[PDB]
A paper describes a structure:
Although the precise link between [name] aggregation and disease remains uncertain, [name] aggregates have been shown to be toxic in cell-based assays, and genetic and animal studies implicate islet amyloid in the progressive loss of pancreatic β-cell function. Over 40 different proteins, with diverse native structures or in many cases intrinsic disorder, form amyloid associated with human disease, yet all amyloid fibrils share a common cross-β architecture consisting of a continuous intermolecular β-sheet supported by networks of zipper and ladder-like interactions. Amyloid fibrils have a similar cross-β architecture, but fibrils formed by a single protein sequence can have diverse structures, varying with time, self-assembly conditions, and sequence modifications.
Virtual screening, ThT assays, and biophysical characterization successfully identified two widely used FDA-approved drugs, canagliflozin and doxazosin, as inhibitors of [name] amyloid formation. Cryo-EM was performed on fibrils assembled from 30 μM [name] in the same buffer used for kinetic assays (160 mM ammonium acetate, pH 7.4, 1% v/v DMSO), in the absence (4 replicates) or presence (2 replicates each) of 50 μM YX-I-1, canagliflozin, or doxazosin. Fibrils with a similar morphology were observed for the control (no small molecule) and doxazosin-containing samples, with the majority having a twisted ribbon morphology and crossover distances of 60–100 nm. The majority of fibrils formed in the control (69%) and doxazosin-treated (72%) samples were classified into three related fibril structures (named LL, [name], and LLUU, respectively), which have a shared structural core consisting of a pair of protofilaments related by a 21-screw symmetry.
Author numbering:
A (entry chain O), B (entry chain R), C (entry chain L), D (entry chain I), E (entry chain F), F (entry chain C): 16 to 30
G (entry chain P), H (entry chain M), I (entry chain J), J (entry chain G), K (entry chain D), L (entry chain A): 10 to 37
M (entry chain N), N (entry chain Q), O (entry chain K), P (entry chain H), Q (entry chain E), R (entry chain B): 14 to 37
Write the structure that this text describes.
Amino acid sequence: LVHSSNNFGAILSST
Amino acid sequence: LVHSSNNFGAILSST
Amino acid sequence: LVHSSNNFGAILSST
Amino acid sequence: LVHSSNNFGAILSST
Amino acid sequence: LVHSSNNFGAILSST
Amino acid sequence: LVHSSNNFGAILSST
Amino acid sequence: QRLANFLVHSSNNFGAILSSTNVGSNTY
Amino acid sequence: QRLANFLVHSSNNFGAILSSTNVGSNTY
Amino acid sequence: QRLANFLVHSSNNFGAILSSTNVGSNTY
Amino acid sequence: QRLANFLVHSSNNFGAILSSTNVGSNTY
Amino acid sequence: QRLANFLVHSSNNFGAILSSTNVGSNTY
Amino acid sequence: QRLANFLVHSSNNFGAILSSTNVGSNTY
Amino acid sequence: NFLVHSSNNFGAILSSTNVGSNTY
Amino acid sequence: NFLVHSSNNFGAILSSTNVGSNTY
Amino acid sequence: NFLVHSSNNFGAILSSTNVGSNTY
Amino acid sequence: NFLVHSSNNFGAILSSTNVGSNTY
Amino acid sequence: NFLVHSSNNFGAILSSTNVGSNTY
Amino acid sequence: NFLVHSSNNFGAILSSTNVGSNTY
């Protein structure tokens, strides 16, 4: 589960 | 489950 | 579970 | 579980 | 479990 | 468990 | 969530880019 | 969450970029 | 969370970048 | 959390970068 | 947590960087 | 935690860096 | 095989070159 | 085979070149 | 095989080059 | 095989080069 | 095989080079 | 095999080079 709030940057998730 | 609120950036998810 | 609030930087998560 | 608040830097997590 | 508050630097965690 | 508050430096943790 | 009076400029690139530039080769 | 009067400039790149530049080779 | 009157400039790069620059080779 | 009147300049790089620069080789 | 009137300049690099620079080789 | 009126300049490097510089080889 | 290249310049030359200012 | 190339310039030349300003 | 290259310059030359200012 | 290269300069030359100012 | 290279300079030359100012 | 290289300079030359100022 990935939760993001007010993301102005770059988010990278690898599973 | 991916939840995004107010995303101004770049979000990358790989599963 | 990944939770991010007000992320202005770069977040990288590898599992 | 990864929790980030007000992240202006670069966060790298490898598991 | 990793908790970060007001991170302006670079945080690296390897497990 | 790693807890960081007001981190302006570089923190490296290896386990 | 309340947000107001904010200007956002976002640019995202996911594609390979190849650029070649030549300026010159003039005889005077 | 309340946010106001903020300007954001975000640039993100995930793609390989190759750039070649040549300036010169002029005869005077 | 209350945030106001803040300017943010964020640049993130995850891609390999190759740059070649040549300036010169002029005959006077 | 209350934050105000702050300017942030953040640059993050995770990609290999190769740069070549040549200046010169002029005949006068 | 209360924070105000602060300027932050953060630069982070995690990638290998190779730089080559040549200046000269001019005949006068 | 209360913090105010502070300027922070942080630089962090985790990547190998190779730099080559040549200046000279001019004939006068 | 006789080849001659002659270039003569007597005029002031001003050159300005800008390459860049790209956002990715 | 006789080839002659002659270029003569006596006029002031001003050149401005801009390449870039692209957003991706 | 006779080849002659001659370049003569008598004019003031001003050159400005900028390469960079790219944000990634 | 006779080759001659001659370059003559009599004009003041001003060159400015900037390479960099890139943010990653 | 006869080769001659001649370069003559009589003009003041000013060169400024900047390489760097990159943020990573 | 006869090769001649001649370079003659009579003009004042000023060269400034800066390489660095990079933040990592």
